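Final report, results section. Input specification for complex C-07:
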Amino acid sequence: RQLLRLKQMNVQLAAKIQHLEFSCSEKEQEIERLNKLLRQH
Amino acid sequence: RQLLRLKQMNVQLAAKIQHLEFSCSEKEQEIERLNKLLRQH
Ligand SMILES: [Cl-]
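Structure output:
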């Protein structure tokens, strides 16, 4: 009950974490693409 | 006992989120820099 409220907050944090892990990986892929353009030029 | 467990885990997840938000924002700031560099040379 307070245990359910906390289990739920925890689920939401773990979901945010999954989300942030993709978003940080994509940013990393874009940086490598922008650096590749810079290096080529 | 289990509520903290959950409390403990909630601290750990919030800590991982803070780290990922910083890594993301570092990369975003780097993307802005590469874009400015590229568009300006
Ligand atoms: Cl790179």
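Residues A 31-32, 35 surround chloride ion (CB under 6 Å). Residues 3-40 of chain B form the longest helix (38 residues). This concludes the modelling results for the funded period.
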